[PDB]
C-alpha cells in the first residue's frame, strides 16, 4: 500500500500551502509551535511530513491550510527589495574603460578580488584580508564607474545597495533590509556589496 499511502499523502499535500514559521520546537515525541502568516500561532502535536530534527526556531515552512500540519521547508526570506538589488545582467566596462585611475584601481582590485581568487597568498603570509573599501571622491571622478568595472570583471555575486534604498519608515525596516542584504550575500558564493552614495545612510 505504498502507492495508496503516497496517493493520500499527495492529496493532502496538494497546493497551495500556507507559509508559516517554526517559532518553537517542543519535546513531549516532538511537537511544533508554528506561527503562520495569517499571524496565527498553532501548536502541532505532530510536526508533519518534514523531519523533526531539520526544523529550527524561526525557519520558514509550508503548512496545510486546514490541518495546519507542516508539509515542507521553504528557503529563507529575502525582501523582494534585497533580491531586486542583486546584479544579474553584469555591466560591461573593462578596466581599460577607466581613465586616470590606475593606483586607485590597483588598490580596489587588490583588496576585493585578491582575497577571493588568490586567498592562498593571504593564508601563507598569515594575514587577514582587508575588509571594506571606501571610495571617496569629489562629485566626478570614477567611483561608480570603477564599481561597475569591478562588478563586470569580477564574476562573483554583486549586490548594489545604494544609500537611500535602506532608509525606510516602519521602524525596524532598513535594519531588516541591511540584515537581509548581508545574509543573501553570505549565502551566495563569494560576493561584493556596493554601497552607492553612502552618506545618505552613514551621516
Amino acid at each position: 500500500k505504498i502507492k495508496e499511502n503516497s496517493e493520500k499523502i499527495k492529496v493532502n499535500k496538494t497546493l497551495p500551502y500556507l507559509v508559516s514559521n517554526v517559532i518553537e520546537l517542543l519535546d513531549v515525541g516532538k511537537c511544533a509551535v508554528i506561527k503562520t502568516s495569517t499571524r496565527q500561532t498553532y501548536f502541532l502535536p505532530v510536526i508533519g511530513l518534514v523531519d523533526a530534527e531539520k526544523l529550527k526556531p524561526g525557519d520558514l515552512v509550508g503548512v496545510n491550510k486546514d490541518s495546519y500540519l507542516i508539509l515542507e521547508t521553504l528557503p529563507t526570506e529575502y525582501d523582494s527589495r534585497v533580491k531586486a538589488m542583486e546584479v544579474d545582467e553584469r555591466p560591461t566596462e573593462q578596466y581599460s574603460d577607466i581613465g586616470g585611475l590606475d593606483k586607485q584601481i590597483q588598490e580596489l582590485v587588490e583588496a576585493i578580488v585578491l582575497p577571493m581568487n588568490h586567498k592562498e597568498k593571504f593564508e601563507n603570509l598569515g594575514i587577514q584580508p582587508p575588509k571594506g573599501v571606501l571610495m571617496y571622491g569629489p562629485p566626478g571622478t570614477g567611483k561608480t564607474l570603477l564599481a561597475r568595472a569591478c562588478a563586470a570583471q569580477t564574476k562573483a555575486t554583486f549586490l548594489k545597495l545604494a544609500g537611500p534604498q535602506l532608509v525606510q519608515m516602519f521602524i525596524g525596516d532598513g535594519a531588516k533590509l541591511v540584515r537581509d542584504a548581508f545574509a543573501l550575500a553570505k549565502e551566495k558564493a563569494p560576493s561584493i556589496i556596493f554601497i552607492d552614495e553612502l552618506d545618505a545612510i552613514g551621516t
Partner: peptide, 14 residues
C-alpha cells in the same frame, strides 16, 4: 509511510 499518514490525520491547535 504509516507514520506519515498518522501525522497527516492530525490537526493543529490554537
Amino acid at each position: 509511510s504509516e507514520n506519515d499518514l498518522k501525522a497527516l490525520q492530525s490537526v493543529g491547535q490554537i
